[PDB]
């Protein structure tokens, strides 16, 4: 799309497991996202002729 | 393993095979490779500058060495999850000396 | 007071086999496949020339 | 199986022959088993999200 | 046999063959090898470091050498049962110079 609003999601952290005993407390891991965004630019070319040159 | 650029590690991979098989009835069975070992093999070049393992393409990993199977994972070097890199780049052995199983497995 | 089963019992729990001699009840899995290396082959009776003795 | 009751039998000593003279005493030799036992451990992973995140 | 890493023992295996066949005038009919000799063979390399016998894979033992048959056992090195390692890694000769037989056998 035109403008700086093009966005790609980036996985930034991931879950990793623990080792635990029989009645030891379970624990949470981590999971995180960032994003990169990008803009557009415009390229143009044109040519002009007199009618006689057409 | 020496960390010099373009060095031949074939002497050292064999030194480990001897280190295992010199003892008793150890039947050496294969390797675990860190994928970073494939670059060390692929760029090993002789005294005259020509490649010692020319058959290794970019983006391959070595799945066999000296006729023995190899399997690749960066879990071998151990810089996975919160782990630090151990500097390990291969493990060789008799993989029947390791017995493994799941007792129970709980889904999501 | 939760019923543990691993040994020794986890802290503040009690073992489900915590009665006298109860651990003799815990399951055991003996592998049918041994850790048993082969022994060295004798080579002299095949290398040597046979003779009556 | 769950526990420390997983067991592999290990051959630990073996018969060795001996050389004896004409009326020298015959001798017995060794034969023995040991075992290695091993234990299970538990790997766990979990993640936790707010209602607004869900 | 020299201890040095990567040394070629082919000069020495030929020196022993020459000792039996010329210095003693005998035939030569094969080798007994310790399995540990196959590593010393397989890792032998040139003055510029290439392997001298690259057809030996890891986990092989050689059953022939220089056209002579070979047979493999650590009874050659002798660290079997209560024996210590003699450091012997091969015996070569005319095996017809060794005559052997059983006078009597008692089964189980």
Residue pair E6/E43 in contact by the 8 Å Cβ criterion:
yes
Question: E29: closest CA among C41, C44, C45, C48?
Answer: C48
Q: How was this structure determined?
A: cryo-EM
Q: Which residues of E touch B28 (CB under 8 A)?
A: 58-59
Q: Collect all residues with Cβ–Cβ distance below 8 Å to A25 and sequence separation of at least 6.
A: none
**Which of C3, C7, C10, C18 would best serve as a mutation to test chain A binding (most A beta carbons within 10 A)?**
C10
Rounded to whole angstroms, the Cα distance separating B53 from C20 reads 66
**Which of C49, C50, C51, C52 would best serve as a mutation to test chain E binding (most E beta carbons within 10 A)?**
C49
Q: How crowded is residue E86: how many other Cβ atoms within 10 Å of its Cβ?
A: 11
Question: Which run of H or of E encompasses B30?
Answer: strand B30-33
Cα B3 from chain centroid (whole Å): 15
What are phi and psi for residue B13, nearest 5 degrees?
A: -60, -40
Handedness of CA D9, D11, D13, D15 (dihedral sign): positive
CA-only gyration radius of chain B, Å: 16
Q: Output the CA–CA distances (angstroms, integers) from residue E89 to B12, D8, E21, E38, E77, in the order listed.
A: 22, 34, 20, 9, 6
Question: E75: closest CA among E90, E96, E56?
Answer: E90
Rounded to whole angstroms, the Cα distance separating B102 from B18 reads 32
Residue pair E81/E93 in contact by the 8 Å Cβ criterion:
no
Rounded to whole angstroms, the Cα distance separating B22 from B65 reads 19
CB contact (8 A) between residue C27 and residue D9: no
SS3 at position A49? coil
Cα B89 from chain centroid (whole Å): 6
Q: Nearest CB to E59: which of B8, B11, B67?
A: B67
Q: How crowded is residue E35: how many other Cβ atoms within 10 Å of its Cβ?
A: 17
Query: In sequence order, which ranges of B22-104 are alpha helices (DSSP H)?
Result: 36-42
Rounded to whole angstroms, the Cα distance separating A30 from A13 reads 6
Inform me whether the C-beta atom of residue A27 falls under 8 Å from chain B C-beta atoms.
no
Rounded to whole angstroms, the Cα distance separating C38 from C33 reads 14
SS3 at position C12? coil
Pairing status of strand E68-72 against strand E64-65: antiparallel
Residue pair E61/E72 in contact by the 8 Å Cβ criterion:
yes
Q: What is the resolution of this structure in A?
A: 2.6
Nearest CA in chain B to D7: B99
Residue pair C41/E75 in contact by the 8 Å Cβ criterion:
yes
Q: Which residues of C touch E75 (CB under 8 A)?
A: 40-44
């Amino acid at each position: 799309i035109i403008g700086d609003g093009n966005v790609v999601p980036v996985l930034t952290k991931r879950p990793s497991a623990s080792i635990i005993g029989e009645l030891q407390n379970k624990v949470d891991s981590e999971l995180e996202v960032g994003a990169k965004n990008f803009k557009t630019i415009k390229a143009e070319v044109g040519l002009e002729f007199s009618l006689e040159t057409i | 393993l020496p960390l010099t650029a373009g060095v031949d590690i074939d002497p050292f991979l064999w030194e480990g095979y001897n280190t295992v098989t010199e003892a008793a009835g150890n039947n050496f069975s294969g390797f675990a490779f860190d994928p970073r070992l494939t670059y060390v093999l692929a760029t090993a070049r002789d005294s005259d500058g020509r490649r010692l393992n020319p058959d290794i393409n970019m983006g391959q990993t070595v799945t066999s060495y000296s006729g023995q199977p190899a399997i690749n994972s960066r879990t071998v070097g151990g810089d996975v999850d919160a782990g630090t890199d151990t500097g390990i780049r291969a493990i060789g052995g008799d993989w029947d000396a390791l017995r493994f199983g799941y007792a129970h497995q709980i889904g999501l | 007071a939760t019923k543990s089963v691993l040994q020794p019992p986890a802290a503040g729990s009690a073992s489900i086999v915590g009665g006298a001699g109860g651990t003799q009840l815990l399951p055991k899995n003996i592998s049918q496949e041994w850790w048993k290396k082969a022994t060295e082959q004798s080579i002299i009776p095949t290398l040597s020339k046979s003779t009556p003795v």
